[PDB]
């Protein structure tokens, strides 16, 4: 038995950056078919193709009992009425929980069961969200500034994007009459 | 099946307090046989029996894939030359990692393998520490203010305090001549 070396890394709570982490960038062009308003999506991709979110991940070999962590910086914006959000996923191993820690900004988490039953959890700095086993989860930025959070998750959880990519979430988070509303997705399969 | 409800809880990054969490308090009298200077321990217990640390825990039923989280508020102080620390433990399931996030104050983590090989990791706010499988871990407050951190750990990791209670750590963290030092534990056997 060799032992893995313990380590510390600095996370800047204001920027979300973790030095030496695997950085990933999701631009709007990378999210075709995720937003309700396809015409608003095409127009925004043409004009700007803005970054929707960036992820800084510190990941281990996929093995039972080990833990990954990542920050996400979710930028503010709307595609039509719909606030910017992360793609969303179930874990590849469904029976894996996750803990989120909100660091900066205003947002929330949309969760749904495999049957499409939905839950909205508000997130402000200091909110810790527990994502239980079997729940798909997507984060949403509802404010004017970046929404930054840290996720800690089992190293073997994986990501299943496919199911969400096709069917989506049963709820959408929109601005309507200057109010943030969590409403039925008109294009929800079921 | 019955799904576990997702939930959000507020963590105050300034105080470590989690709303509605299971609170535990460890006083100096709860830590007989932990500190090198037994006479200093006895004198301080008699004079004050200070609170050494408090823990606010949000725990799930012990099952693979699930996650617990907890804040600790580690108070400043010394027993003789030795800084206040947590009892320290291995996980009962040794193959379980943990992630710590430092929130306030100045401190660090002492880690040790089953063979007694040791490592110190400095923690200042924003430091995330990865505790690998098979490492015992103890946090230490090396400053004049509370050292506050959040730990996220597998719900089935459990706690093995007994090994540490009997053998201690191979290194100790002290103040000598106004300098903070990590040095060999004189009472360590090996
Ligand atoms: O939930 C996790 C990991 O299990 C987060 O680290 C997300 O992966 C990240 O916020 C990006 O979101 P997705 O693009 O993966 O939905
Ligand atoms: O590592 C963990 C849990 O696995 C921390 O939440 C500690 O339990 C806490 O800092 C108190 O310290 P101990 O008294 O448990 O050493
Ligand atoms: Mn996830
Ligand atoms: Mn632990």
UniProtKB/Swiss-Prot annotation, chains A, B:
The keyword Hydrolase does not apply. This is Glucose-6-phosphate isomerase. Belongs to the archaeal-type GPI family. Keywords: Cytoplasm, Gluconeogenesis, Glycolysis, Iron, Isomerase, Metal-binding. Its cofactor is Fe cation. It comes from Pyrococcus furiosus (strain ATCC 43587 / DSM 3638 / JCM 8422 / Vc1). Optimum temperature is 90-96 degrees Celsius. Highly thermostable. Its main location: cytoplasm. The lineage of its organism: Archaea, Methanobacteriati, Methanobacteriota, Thermococci, Thermococcales.
